[PDB]
Design a protein around this ligand. Structure first.
Ligand code: HEM
Ligand SMILES: CC1(C)[C@@H]2CC[C@@]1(C)C(=O)C2
Ligand SMILES: [C-]#N
Ligand SMILES: [K+]
Length: 405
């Protein structure tokens, strides 16, 4: 299903990469995308897949374009165009200067002071889950830990009842790696539908939860509207229910397959914060994009107004020009270069919450279940898209090797 080459796009720059189903997906998704950085591939290519779009394949260009919001607008960040056009989440669908007032408000509800405040709860949720799993000697890591640990933290943060988790998790899945049950726009509207009545309840009775704070915030010298609160809370939901969930699985799949890396963190726990950055580089998983606001020549390439450009956050840290032996995981790597949380004015607001969840997971899992591996006869399957992920991760261990601290 290829779209015909637009007239202004030179055919010598075509490389038909499919972001929702890469060729080498069997070898791992970061591997599958890494083909965009083979010797023969230009720094900037055009794929005719998914409606047709540009792809920057190197961190230098990826960074540059994320810095230049004049030319590369986040007004239409999702591929395909239909999704990107429907996309109106706040702050992501906004450029500076308009973006910054809304980003300050969102930073209030997931930024570092919130995270510090939630440290003991994060720790308790991890411990509770792991202690419950520990004697079993096995789990599906994605649905037994990777999903409920971040999601319960987020529901706590947002003041939303855990009974709603199955509903909301289903909706977020479909905006990110769509099956076909519902379009991006349909999944987005359903999430908006969930939120509106909750926002209205909390505007009148102002509280401490993320939704109350947003709903009662002030932007550009006026109260925020219900419609604006909704567009912002919907986005926070997506971040809290999907991306960290999928990153934890990549990291745990790797640790499960690499006893020596588990051992290094067990033996030298002080390296865990540095280890968290090197996993974030290696198992980077996001890829959205921008849309051209005007005709623009970018690195010798003529981009036209309305062109979409995929700027894969994933690829910058896998670029051998920024990190030697990029596919190798080295916890003592001297300068870990990545853009896993993005680059420019949309730099992930959740990054401090994410790092805490990752670091607490590494610490608590490895303290209690130091020895584990992939279940016998299992092959791990990755999924690709805006946010790539792990389909399933069956783990096993001898409960006699486990610890209660
Ligand atoms: C490993 C975990 C995570 C990764 C890799 C990640 C990745 C990213 C990336 C690449 C962006 C920028 C997208 C762009 O420039 O268009 C972003 C933005 C954002 N993230 Fe995350 N994320 C993670 C976790 C979280 C969490 C836990 C939250 C909590 C709510 C969150 C909330 C947000 C929000 C609100 C934005 C929009 C910022 C803006 O547009 O100004 N994220 N993330
Ligand atoms: C691309 C993102 C990671 C960023 C936060 C959630 C996400 C899917 C968005 O829609 C904006
Ligand atoms: C961010 N997700
Ligand atoms: K849009």
């Amino acid at each position: 299903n290829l779209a015909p080459l637009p007239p202004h796009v030179p055919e010598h720059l075509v490389f038909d990469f499919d972001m929702y189903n890469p060729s080498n997906l069997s070898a791992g998704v970061q591997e599958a995308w890494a083909v965009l950085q083979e010797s023969n591939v230009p720094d900037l290519v055009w794929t005719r897949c998914n409606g047709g779009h540009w792809i920057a394949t190197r961190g230098q260009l990826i960074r540059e374009a994320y810095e230049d919001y004049r030319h590369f607008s986040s007004e239409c960040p999702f591929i395909p165009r239909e999704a990107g056009e429907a996309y109106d989440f706040i702050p992501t669908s906004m450029d500076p200067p308009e973006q910054r007032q809304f980003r300050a408000l969102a930073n209030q509800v997931v930024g570092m002071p919130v995270v510090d405040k939630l440290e003991n709860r994060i720790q308790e949720l991890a411990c509770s889950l792991i202690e419950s799993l520990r004697p079993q000697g096995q789990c599906n890591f994605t649905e037994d830990y990777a999903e409920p640990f971040p999601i319960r933290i987020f529901m706590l943060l947002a003041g939303l009842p855990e009974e709603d988790i199955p509903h909301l998790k289903y909706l977020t899945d479909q905006m990110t790696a769509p099956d076909g049950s519902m379009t991006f726009a349909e999944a987005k509207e359903a999430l908006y539908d969930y939120l509106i009545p909750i926002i209205e309840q909390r505007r009148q009775k102002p509280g401490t939860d993320a939704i109350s704070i947003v709903a009662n915030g002030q932007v550009n010298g006026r109260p925020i509207t219900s419609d604006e609160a909704k567009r912002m809370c919907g986005l926070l939901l997506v971040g809290g229910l999907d991306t960290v969930v999928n990153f934890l699985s990549f990291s745990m799949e790797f640790l499960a397959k690499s006893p020596e890396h588990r051992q290094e963190l067990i033996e030298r726990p002080e390296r865990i914060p540095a280890a968290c950055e090197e996993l974030l580089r290696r198992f980077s998983l996001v890829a959205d994009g921008r849309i051209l606001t005007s005709d623009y020549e970018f690195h010798g390439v003529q981009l036209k107004k309305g062109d979409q450009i995929l700027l894969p956050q994933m690829l910058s840290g896998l670029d051998e020009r920024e990190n030697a032996a990029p596919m190798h995981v080295d916890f003592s790597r001297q300068k870990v270069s990545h853009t896993t949380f993005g680059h420019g004015s949309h730099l992930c607001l959740g990054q401090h919450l994410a790092r805490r969840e990752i670091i607490v997971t590494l610490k608590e899992w490895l303290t209690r279940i130091p020895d584990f591996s992939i279940a016998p006869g299992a092959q791990i399957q990755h999924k690709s898209g805006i946010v790539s992920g792990v389909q399933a991760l069956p783990l096993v261990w001898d409960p006699a090797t486990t610890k209660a601290v």
